RNA sequence: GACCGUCGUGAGACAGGUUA
RNA sequence: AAUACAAACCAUGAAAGUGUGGCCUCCUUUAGUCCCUCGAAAUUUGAGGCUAGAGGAGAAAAGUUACCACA
């Protein structure tokens, strides 16, 4: 899928 | 804060903080192997605990006393089941 | 394929010399130079010649089953066992010999212990717990065992008592058929 | 090289934990519990309350520590927290309550001392800035640098910081492995329990102009 | 003293971790051997010589 | 400082009765086992 | 009959056992 | 609960109506290619190769038994 999690912002974003 | 309905609910409040550290632990574990470090302590790492060993000895004794009380009370049940 | 190790040959020669008197005669340089070198396989020891070992070391370990004549096997605890397979070696150069009669050899070959009525004649200077080899009237090698008591105590005990404790006999030959 | 960090880029951090002159055994045990977890910190005790706040700065400059965690005790009953970047950086003040220490035999969790934690933050620690400043100060105080030679390597605990009412609740749990049925992480809680209510943000080291004021704080 | 295995007590994260494994861990030869093992049988005969003198304890019984 | 020459064994103040059977004593920061310098 | 034993463990024995 | 179908809902369009949520998953046991090689066999088979259904810290000693003796 085109979605991973950002640890330093705590959101979901695409590749 | 949306997970906690009432702040005096000790069961739900403990579960909310536990649930928060749950997905933090699983997500951190996944990212830590992708980079790759030794994550899990092996059977041979006799390393020094944050707690005194004797503290774990008395907490092991307390878990004995609570669990042995439950089953000894069940033996008291079976004696009085014979009574009725 | 391997030979006897240090402790493993020590216990083997400990239990052998408890029943053997001339270990030098059994393993010695012969006329041709061939030697009676020990051998083990699948935790079971054997007594072979060296030239037998050369024509048997060419074989994969799992395909070989036995080699020469067998002496015994080792348990999980590590103690040694000597079998009735080692009897022709054992009876050849025996230290202490006990002869039992035909009416007493039949319970001996069945699996019963040795009684004072079973024995015909006796050897001398036999200690309490020393090993011995059991023969008949016709010097046929029957078995081996450890006596219950010494020679003098056997004279003064009841004839119905147990004399020499029966360890092995020809029943293993009848069992394996 | 003197900062004992074996890493590609060194995270040079040090903390200095301190105590006031009137703390309790419950506040004293939180020194011992936090400093045991915190591998790049020094313990010091009994700072004079008759001194000034900025004498906590050259106390830390004496020991080469850019962070300071001060336990200040008032009345012999109340714990007050202070997190601060020592030379010129921002500081914070909390009121700490609902204390439960590692010595109490009811947590049933344990971990290596000096092992690296995972920092489990909250969602409001990102969106609202007064939580964001203390977020970086929490992250620096529990920074535990990469190549620190006093740190035990295997990771087995996670520190959870969450805000519920207006107050931050700390949690510590042990990472344990139980195999999945045809291994998942099960958390057993280890150590300190306290509730952390913000009071101020000051733009100086220990004085400096006031930046946040919590105008809902009921003092004891 | 009731057994732990049936007892509902989880493992504890002491200094010993969860799950601890135990550590992995000649002509003259014939000569010394015979001598040593015969020397043991010779010792048996000596204890048996005190049993040949134990017939005096059996005689003392009768007397 | 007290923590200047910090040792590499990554061990605690645990008694040396442990690590007396396994061939390695302690680990390091990366995680490589440390096998005893003298036997 | 049922135990404390002593002597051996590949199996066993006892004028040794608290009274006259 | 999944799945099938129907209805509701939703997206667009002014209306008319339209519209939607893929295809796969080293040896041991087994079958086939009767394909190739080596043989046998007065013409048919045997053994290998190949293909495809499924399994898997080391010499210090371990695992297990409606088993034996002892406590």
mmCIF file of N, CA and C in Angstrom, chain C residues 34-114:
data_model
loop_
_atom_site.group_PDB
_atom_site.id
_atom_site.type_symbol
_atom_site.label_atom_id
_atom_site.label_comp_id
_atom_site.label_asym_id
_atom_site.label_seq_id
_atom_site.Cartn_x
_atom_site.Cartn_y
_atom_site.Cartn_z
ATOM 1 N N UNK C 34 49.442 -58.899 13.799
ATOM 2 C CA UNK C 34 48.062 -58.467 13.962
ATOM 3 C C UNK C 34 47.686 -58.438 15.440
ATOM 4 N N UNK C 35 46.918 -57.424 15.829
ATOM 5 C CA UNK C 35 46.564 -57.200 17.223
ATOM 6 C C UNK C 35 45.051 -57.219 17.404
ATOM 7 N N UNK C 36 44.621 -57.662 18.587
ATOM 8 C CA UNK C 36 43.203 -57.721 18.951
ATOM 9 C C UNK C 36 42.759 -56.348 19.452
ATOM 10 N N UNK C 37 42.520 -55.447 18.507
ATOM 11 C CA UNK C 37 42.174 -54.063 18.813
ATOM 12 C C UNK C 37 40.680 -53.963 19.089
ATOM 13 N N UNK C 38 40.326 -53.233 20.144
ATOM 14 C CA UNK C 38 38.930 -53.022 20.498
ATOM 15 C C UNK C 38 38.225 -52.152 19.458
ATOM 16 N N UNK C 39 36.896 -52.242 19.449
ATOM 17 C CA UNK C 39 36.072 -51.548 18.470
ATOM 18 C C UNK C 39 34.668 -51.394 19.040
ATOM 19 N N UNK C 40 34.029 -50.254 18.761
ATOM 20 C CA UNK C 40 32.666 -50.006 19.209
ATOM 21 C C UNK C 40 31.818 -49.490 18.054
ATOM 22 N N UNK C 41 30.517 -49.769 18.126
ATOM 23 C CA UNK C 41 29.568 -49.345 17.103
ATOM 24 C C UNK C 41 28.179 -49.262 17.714
ATOM 25 N N UNK C 42 27.527 -48.105 17.543
ATOM 26 C CA UNK C 42 26.166 -47.844 18.031
ATOM 27 C C UNK C 42 26.047 -48.087 19.537
ATOM 28 N N UNK C 43 27.024 -47.553 20.282
ATOM 29 C CA UNK C 43 27.146 -47.719 21.737
ATOM 30 C C UNK C 43 27.223 -49.190 22.141
ATOM 31 N N UNK C 44 27.821 -50.014 21.282
ATOM 32 C CA UNK C 44 28.006 -51.437 21.524
ATOM 33 C C UNK C 44 29.422 -51.803 21.111
ATOM 34 N N UNK C 45 30.198 -52.350 22.044
ATOM 35 C CA UNK C 45 31.613 -52.598 21.817
ATOM 36 C C UNK C 45 31.786 -53.975 21.191
ATOM 37 N N UNK C 46 32.963 -54.194 20.608
ATOM 38 C CA UNK C 46 33.302 -55.455 19.966
ATOM 39 C C UNK C 46 34.775 -55.759 20.203
ATOM 40 N N UNK C 47 35.137 -57.025 20.003
ATOM 41 C CA UNK C 47 36.520 -57.482 20.100
ATOM 42 C C UNK C 47 36.930 -58.088 18.766
ATOM 43 N N UNK C 48 37.723 -57.345 17.994
ATOM 44 C CA UNK C 48 38.125 -57.743 16.651
ATOM 45 C C UNK C 48 39.645 -57.701 16.554
ATOM 46 N N UNK C 49 40.159 -58.244 15.456
ATOM 47 C CA UNK C 49 41.556 -58.075 15.101
ATOM 48 C C UNK C 49 41.732 -56.789 14.299
ATOM 49 N N UNK C 50 42.983 -56.327 14.220
ATOM 50 C CA UNK C 50 43.274 -55.121 13.453
ATOM 51 C C UNK C 50 42.998 -55.315 11.969
ATOM 52 N N UNK C 51 43.388 -56.462 11.402
ATOM 53 C CA UNK C 51 43.160 -56.704 9.978
ATOM 54 C C UNK C 51 41.672 -56.823 9.668
ATOM 55 N N UNK C 52 40.877 -57.244 10.652
ATOM 56 C CA UNK C 52 39.425 -57.200 10.513
ATOM 57 C C UNK C 52 38.943 -55.753 10.455
ATOM 58 N N UNK C 53 39.577 -54.868 11.230
ATOM 59 C CA UNK C 53 39.149 -53.471 11.270
ATOM 60 C C UNK C 53 39.466 -52.743 9.966
ATOM 61 N N UNK C 54 40.587 -53.085 9.324
ATOM 62 C CA UNK C 54 40.948 -52.460 8.052
ATOM 63 C C UNK C 54 39.959 -52.812 6.943
ATOM 64 N N UNK C 55 39.479 -54.055 6.922
ATOM 65 C CA UNK C 55 38.572 -54.488 5.864
ATOM 66 C C UNK C 55 37.132 -54.158 6.242
ATOM 67 N N UNK C 56 36.946 -53.504 7.391
ATOM 68 C CA UNK C 56 35.636 -53.040 7.820
ATOM 69 C C UNK C 56 35.536 -51.525 7.936
ATOM 70 N N UNK C 57 36.663 -50.811 7.949
ATOM 71 C CA UNK C 57 36.637 -49.354 7.981
ATOM 72 C C UNK C 57 36.334 -48.743 6.620
ATOM 73 N N UNK C 58 36.238 -49.562 5.574
ATOM 74 C CA UNK C 58 35.897 -49.112 4.232
ATOM 75 C C UNK C 58 34.408 -48.882 4.054
ATOM 76 N N UNK C 59 33.616 -49.147 5.086
ATOM 77 C CA UNK C 59 32.166 -49.202 4.998
ATOM 78 C C UNK C 59 31.591 -47.991 5.721
ATOM 79 N N UNK C 60 30.489 -47.462 5.187
ATOM 80 C CA UNK C 60 29.723 -46.441 5.883
ATOM 81 C C UNK C 60 29.208 -46.972 7.219
ATOM 82 N N UNK C 61 29.122 -46.067 8.197
ATOM 83 C CA UNK C 61 28.815 -46.452 9.573
ATOM 84 C C UNK C 61 27.411 -47.037 9.700
ATOM 85 N N UNK C 62 26.432 -46.427 9.026
ATOM 86 C CA UNK C 62 25.045 -46.859 9.174
ATOM 87 C C UNK C 62 24.796 -48.219 8.531
ATOM 88 N N UNK C 63 25.564 -48.570 7.499
ATOM 89 C CA UNK C 63 25.374 -49.857 6.840
ATOM 90 C C UNK C 63 25.914 -51.014 7.675
ATOM 91 N N UNK C 64 26.968 -50.782 8.450
ATOM 92 C CA UNK C 64 27.520 -51.832 9.296
ATOM 93 C C UNK C 64 26.658 -52.023 10.538
ATOM 94 N N UNK C 65 26.454 -53.283 10.925
ATOM 95 C CA UNK C 65 25.663 -53.616 12.105
ATOM 96 C C UNK C 65 26.522 -54.173 13.233
ATOM 97 N N UNK C 66 27.267 -55.244 12.979
ATOM 98 C CA UNK C 66 28.154 -55.842 13.966
ATOM 99 C C UNK C 66 29.530 -56.024 13.339
ATOM 100 N N UNK C 67 30.499 -56.407 14.165
ATOM 101 C CA UNK C 67 31.881 -56.506 13.707
ATOM 102 C C UNK C 67 32.614 -57.481 14.612
ATOM 103 N N UNK C 68 33.066 -58.600 14.050
ATOM 104 C CA UNK C 68 33.756 -59.603 14.853
ATOM 105 C C UNK C 68 32.814 -60.254 15.849
ATOM 106 N N UNK C 69 33.232 -60.288 17.113
ATOM 107 C CA UNK C 69 32.411 -60.795 18.204
ATOM 108 C C UNK C 69 32.130 -59.661 19.181
ATOM 109 N N UNK C 70 30.937 -59.676 19.770
ATOM 110 C CA UNK C 70 30.520 -58.586 20.641
ATOM 111 C C UNK C 70 30.914 -58.859 22.088
ATOM 112 N N UNK C 71 31.193 -57.784 22.824
ATOM 113 C CA UNK C 71 31.482 -57.853 24.250
ATOM 114 C C UNK C 71 30.352 -57.300 25.108
ATOM 115 N N UNK C 72 29.712 -56.224 24.668
ATOM 116 C CA UNK C 72 28.626 -55.640 25.425
ATOM 117 C C UNK C 72 28.267 -54.275 24.876
ATOM 118 N N UNK C 73 27.473 -53.546 25.656
ATOM 119 C CA UNK C 73 27.002 -52.226 25.270
ATOM 120 C C UNK C 73 27.073 -51.280 26.462
ATOM 121 N N UNK C 74 26.922 -49.989 26.179
ATOM 122 C CA UNK C 74 26.920 -48.953 27.201
ATOM 123 C C UNK C 74 25.523 -48.381 27.382
ATOM 124 N N UNK C 75 25.164 -48.121 28.636
ATOM 125 C CA UNK C 75 23.891 -47.501 28.964
ATOM 126 C C UNK C 75 23.996 -45.984 28.833
ATOM 127 N N UNK C 76 22.910 -45.293 29.185
ATOM 128 C CA UNK C 76 22.924 -43.835 29.156
ATOM 129 C C UNK C 76 23.738 -43.257 30.307
ATOM 130 N N UNK C 77 23.802 -43.964 31.438
ATOM 131 C CA UNK C 77 24.585 -43.488 32.574
ATOM 132 C C UNK C 77 26.083 -43.652 32.356
ATOM 133 N N UNK C 78 26.491 -44.488 31.405
ATOM 134 C CA UNK C 78 27.891 -44.676 31.090
ATOM 135 C C UNK C 78 28.531 -45.921 31.665
ATOM 136 N N UNK C 79 27.790 -46.731 32.418
ATOM 137 C CA UNK C 79 28.368 -47.949 32.964
ATOM 138 C C UNK C 79 28.501 -49.007 31.872
ATOM 139 N N UNK C 80 29.411 -49.950 32.098
ATOM 140 C CA UNK C 80 29.722 -50.974 31.114
ATOM 141 C C UNK C 80 28.919 -52.241 31.381
ATOM 142 N N UNK C 81 28.598 -52.943 30.301
ATOM 143 C CA UNK C 81 27.895 -54.215 30.336
ATOM 144 C C UNK C 81 28.727 -55.243 29.586
ATOM 145 N N UNK C 82 28.858 -56.432 30.167
ATOM 146 C CA UNK C 82 29.440 -57.571 29.478
ATOM 147 C C UNK C 82 28.358 -58.626 29.280
ATOM 148 N N UNK C 83 28.275 -59.139 28.059
ATOM 149 C CA UNK C 83 27.178 -59.995 27.642
ATOM 150 C C UNK C 83 27.618 -61.452 27.616
ATOM 151 N N UNK C 84 26.665 -62.316 27.255
ATOM 152 C CA UNK C 84 26.969 -63.722 27.031
ATOM 153 C C UNK C 84 27.655 -63.922 25.682
ATOM 154 N N UNK C 85 27.689 -62.882 24.843
ATOM 155 C CA UNK C 85 28.461 -62.935 23.608
ATOM 156 C C UNK C 85 29.960 -62.980 23.885
ATOM 157 N N UNK C 86 30.397 -62.418 25.009
ATOM 158 C CA UNK C 86 31.803 -62.402 25.389
ATOM 159 C C UNK C 86 32.229 -63.658 26.138
ATOM 160 N N UNK C 87 31.320 -64.617 26.316
ATOM 161 C CA UNK C 87 31.613 -65.862 27.030
ATOM 162 C C UNK C 87 32.748 -66.705 26.442
ATOM 163 N N UNK C 88 32.845 -66.956 25.118
ATOM 164 C CA UNK C 88 34.016 -67.718 24.631
ATOM 165 C C UNK C 88 35.345 -67.030 24.894
ATOM 166 N N UNK C 89 35.370 -65.697 24.855
ATOM 167 C CA UNK C 89 36.549 -64.963 25.305
ATOM 168 C C UNK C 89 36.709 -65.102 26.814
ATOM 169 N N UNK C 90 35.594 -65.036 27.545
ATOM 170 C CA UNK C 90 35.643 -65.047 29.004
ATOM 171 C C UNK C 90 36.056 -66.410 29.546
ATOM 172 N N UNK C 91 35.537 -67.488 28.956
ATOM 173 C CA UNK C 91 35.794 -68.817 29.497
ATOM 174 C C UNK C 91 37.145 -69.362 29.055
ATOM 175 N N UNK C 92 37.797 -68.700 28.098
ATOM 176 C CA UNK C 92 39.072 -69.191 27.586
ATOM 177 C C UNK C 92 40.171 -69.079 28.635
ATOM 178 N N UNK C 93 40.226 -67.951 29.343
ATOM 179 C CA UNK C 93 41.324 -67.653 30.254
ATOM 180 C C UNK C 93 40.692 -67.233 31.594
ATOM 181 N N UNK C 94 39.770 -68.056 32.086
ATOM 182 C CA UNK C 94 38.980 -67.686 33.251
ATOM 183 C C UNK C 94 39.808 -67.756 34.529
ATOM 184 N N UNK C 95 39.552 -66.811 35.435
ATOM 185 C CA UNK C 95 40.236 -66.811 36.728
ATOM 186 C C UNK C 95 39.575 -67.798 37.683
ATOM 187 N N UNK C 96 38.299 -67.575 37.984
ATOM 188 C CA UNK C 96 37.548 -68.387 38.931
ATOM 189 C C UNK C 96 36.469 -69.156 38.182
ATOM 190 N N UNK C 97 36.443 -70.473 38.373
ATOM 191 C CA UNK C 97 35.517 -71.357 37.679
ATOM 192 C C UNK C 97 34.663 -72.103 38.694
ATOM 193 N N UNK C 98 33.357 -72.154 38.441
ATOM 194 C CA UNK C 98 32.401 -72.863 39.285
ATOM 195 C C UNK C 98 31.644 -73.844 38.401
ATOM 196 N N UNK C 99 31.579 -75.104 38.828
ATOM 197 C CA UNK C 99 30.976 -76.169 38.040
ATOM 198 C C UNK C 99 29.643 -76.577 38.657
ATOM 199 N N UNK C 100 28.580 -76.557 37.849
ATOM 200 C CA UNK C 100 27.244 -76.902 38.312
ATOM 201 C C UNK C 100 26.791 -78.182 37.619
ATOM 202 N N UNK C 101 25.908 -78.917 38.292
ATOM 203 C CA UNK C 101 25.486 -80.213 37.783
ATOM 204 C C UNK C 101 24.369 -80.042 36.755
ATOM 205 N N UNK C 102 24.016 -81.148 36.092
ATOM 206 C CA UNK C 102 23.037 -81.095 35.008
ATOM 207 C C UNK C 102 21.641 -80.771 35.527
ATOM 208 N N UNK C 103 21.294 -81.263 36.719
ATOM 209 C CA UNK C 103 20.014 -80.901 37.315
ATOM 210 C C UNK C 103 20.019 -79.481 37.864
ATOM 211 N N UNK C 104 21.190 -78.857 37.974
ATOM 212 C CA UNK C 104 21.284 -77.480 38.406
ATOM 213 C C UNK C 104 21.577 -76.526 37.267
ATOM 214 N N UNK C 105 22.133 -77.052 36.173
ATOM 215 C CA UNK C 105 22.371 -76.229 34.994
ATOM 216 C C UNK C 105 21.079 -75.895 34.263
ATOM 217 N N UNK C 106 20.090 -76.788 34.313
ATOM 218 C CA UNK C 106 18.805 -76.519 33.671
ATOM 219 C C UNK C 106 18.067 -75.322 34.275
ATOM 220 N N UNK C 107 17.970 -75.142 35.605
ATOM 221 C CA UNK C 107 17.477 -73.844 36.097
ATOM 222 C C UNK C 107 18.419 -72.690 35.794
ATOM 223 N N UNK C 108 19.728 -72.946 35.710
ATOM 224 C CA UNK C 108 20.673 -71.893 35.352
ATOM 225 C C UNK C 108 20.446 -71.409 33.925
ATOM 226 N N UNK C 109 20.185 -72.334 32.998
ATOM 227 C CA UNK C 109 19.896 -71.942 31.625
ATOM 228 C C UNK C 109 18.475 -71.415 31.463
ATOM 229 N N UNK C 110 17.579 -71.720 32.406
ATOM 230 C CA UNK C 110 16.238 -71.144 32.361
ATOM 231 C C UNK C 110 16.251 -69.682 32.788
ATOM 232 N N UNK C 111 17.068 -69.343 33.782
ATOM 233 C CA UNK C 111 17.118 -67.988 34.294
ATOM 234 C C UNK C 111 17.088 -67.917 35.807
ATOM 235 N N UNK C 112 17.224 -69.065 36.464
ATOM 236 C CA UNK C 112 17.227 -69.125 37.918
ATOM 237 C C UNK C 112 18.647 -69.007 38.457
ATOM 238 N N UNK C 113 18.748 -68.592 39.717
ATOM 239 C CA UNK C 113 20.044 -68.395 40.346
ATOM 240 C C UNK C 113 20.658 -69.731 40.758
ATOM 241 N N UNK C 114 21.911 -69.667 41.202
ATOM 242 C CA UNK C 114 22.678 -70.868 41.522
ATOM 243 C C UNK C 114 22.463 -71.233 42.986
#
